[PDB]
Design an enzyme around this catalytic site. Structure first.
Site, PDB file in Angstrom:
ATOM      1  NE  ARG A 226      -3.973  -2.056   0.495  1.00 46.78           N
ATOM      2  CZ  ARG A 226      -4.088  -3.202  -0.171  1.00 46.78           C
ATOM      3  NH1 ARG A 226      -3.423  -3.398  -1.295  1.00 46.78           N
ATOM      4  NH2 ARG A 226      -4.900  -4.151   0.280  1.00 46.78           N
ATOM      5  CD  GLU A 255      -4.295   3.427  -4.506  1.00 51.35           C
ATOM      6  OE1 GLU A 255      -5.213   2.695  -4.912  1.00 51.35           O
ATOM      7  OE2 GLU A 255      -3.313   3.047  -3.884  1.00 51.35           O
ATOM      8  CG  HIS A 274      -4.629  -0.588  -6.082  1.00 47.91           C
ATOM      9  ND1 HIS A 274      -5.068  -0.156  -4.847  1.00 47.91           N
ATOM     10  CD2 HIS A 274      -4.278  -1.888  -5.896  1.00 47.91           C
ATOM     11  CE1 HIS A 274      -4.998  -1.157  -3.973  1.00 47.91           C
ATOM     12  NE2 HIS A 274      -4.546  -2.227  -4.579  1.00 47.91           N
TER      13      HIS A 274
END
Ligand SMILES: [Mg+2]
Ligand SMILES: [Mg+2]
Ligand SMILES: [Mg+2]
Ligand SMILES: [Mg+2]
Ligand SMILES: [Mg+2]
Ligand code: NA
Ligand code: NA
EC number: 1.1.1.-
Lengths: 308, 308
Positions: A226, A255, A274
């Site tokens: 992360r 994000e 992602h």
């Protein structure tokens, strides 16, 4: 526990076509049906869902379609006698191939070639730029299923593989495992450092200016953990200063990665959105766990990926 | 034949820093020295060179630093008693990693993410697009040294590997070997078709509109052989039509690939500039060979990679 029905919560749409997922669960033994947001659940009910709802506690069994159930109140699940399972352990192949692709991209200079293609430009690399992964060192930080996925493909490509995990215990295809208090030692000689740990209190911000200082100046960082495992400002500074050569980043502190981030404009950074675990077969991979646990409820064996 | 000296043609510079090459030759047994583009060479003289030179026929021994030999007068080396070798067999690692990188690029969609990075755009792929190499079929056409390098990395990444060569005999890591007259059979079920054969009479133009018809429409062509193994205009048409999905091309009918070629502008084509074998240690790899062959001259054994 005897399962009468399988309910596909609409929340699975956030990761896959619900329709395609029902198709993949059609050979289960039990009626599968798309659940609305207004559904009660009796005994005999299994729910498959992305996120949490309180209505689920009147069901026998919930399976989270994610690896991560930080959405899900584990105590309250225990209280109700409602079984909770997750989809941990099915991401090693997608993520480990993404990472091998990142590393081969940097080694063979595919990303610069792609930049050149935009401009119809036959630009030869400098002699020093192209290398091979065989014999280079990768450090994988975190050696659960994500990292093991990275490791296996790095070892398949002939890399020297070291890593970092809490126990310090050996892992197949890893030459040297270090404990997290020898992080600096583990990363100092690595051509790539790959981050593959859960975000916890302990791991938040573990990669920052001092780590970038220890790392080789020709090394690259890969983040598939992360964003907040890394101090993002220190990464930008380390890139600007040449403390490391580059990075491949799948996750970020915010994000979508805001348009004004400096990370977009380094040649030797790869931004991906992602998607390191994206697979057109996600439905079949989750459906295979559902199926495995149905067959396990029917013989009385305990459930794979049981939380409570 | 007793070897006094080693010389280094000026136009090995066209593939590697001759200074770096001299470093890597300094554990040989015999004096190493740079050559001008006019020098004469007696008995005991060894030359290493890119291309042909007539002043070198007074030497004992010429080593071509290329895999190729087609720019050498093969006859006239016979006459003066001058040994000729090449650098075949040293490209399986670089080329195999480039091809693995191409395939991981298509499966994980890194090329589309890199185009998005130019635009600071968070562009998720469609659910259907990202896949894994594990379990998919590659067909490697040509199972010499180049192809085997592709084969070993594709097998290590879990692909199903088939291939094509003249003998049709078993090859390590290949499930099924087909003869060249079953090319269509070999490529019909492949997600990737990879070209790794020498350009000959027999192979020129072997991949054209009929092969693109037989190939799966979600399949991609990889060319790391030579441009004219493919009929380039039929590849363009096959791409425009959707006969195949894409290609990764390192080699072309005309090099540099002219600016106006439509191959630059397909999203699912990767152009690279005849670099699938680029390595920053090319000097060490050729050095290794030189050392093998002077030790073979001194104990009367046959020369590695000897043509003449
Ligand atoms: Mg123990
Ligand atoms: Mg620290
Ligand atoms: Mg820009
Ligand atoms: Mg034909
Ligand atoms: Mg264009
Ligand atoms: Na550093
Ligand atoms: Na076709």
């Amino acid at each position: 526990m005897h399962i009468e029905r399988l309910a596909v919560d609409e929340s699975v749409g956030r990761a896959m076509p619900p329709q395609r997922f029902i198709e993949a669960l059609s050979d289960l033994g039990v009626p599968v049906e798309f659940a609305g947001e207004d559904e009660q659940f009796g005994p005999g009910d299994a729910v498959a869902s992305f996120g949490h709802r309180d209505a689920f506690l009147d069901a026998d069994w919930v399976h989270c379609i994610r690896a991560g159930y930080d959405e899900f109140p584990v105590g309250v699940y225990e209280e109700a006698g409602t079984y909770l399972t997750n989809s941990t352990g099915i991401h090693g192949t997608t993520v480990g191939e993404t990472v091998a692709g990142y590393m081969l991209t940097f080694a063979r200079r595919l990303h610069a070639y792609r930049d050149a293609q935009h401009d119809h430009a036959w630009d030869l690399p400098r002699y020093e730029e192209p290398f091979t992964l065989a014999g280079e060192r990768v450090c994988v930080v975190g050696l659960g299923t994500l990292g093991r996925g990275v490791v296996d493909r790095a070892a398949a490509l002939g890399m020297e593989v070291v890593g970092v995990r809490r126990s310090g215990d050996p892992v197949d295809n890893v030459s040297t495992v270090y404990t997290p208090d020898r992080l600096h030692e583990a990363i100092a000689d690595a051509r790539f450092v790959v981050l593959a740990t859960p975000l916890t209190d302990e791991t938040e911000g573990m990669v920052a200016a001092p780590e970038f200082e220890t790392m080789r100046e020709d090394a690259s960082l890969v983040n598939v953990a992360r964003g907040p495992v890394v101090v993002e400002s220190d990464l930008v500074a380390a890139l600007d200063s040449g403390d490391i050569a580059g990075a491949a980043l799948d996750v970020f502190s915010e994000e979508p990665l805001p348009e004004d981030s400096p990370l977009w404009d380094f040649e030797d950074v790869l931004i991906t959105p992602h998607v390191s675990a994206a697979t057109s077969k996600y439905h079949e991979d989750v459906a295979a766990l559902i199926r495995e646990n149905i067959e396990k409820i029917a013989t009385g064996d305990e459930l794979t990926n049981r939380v409570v």
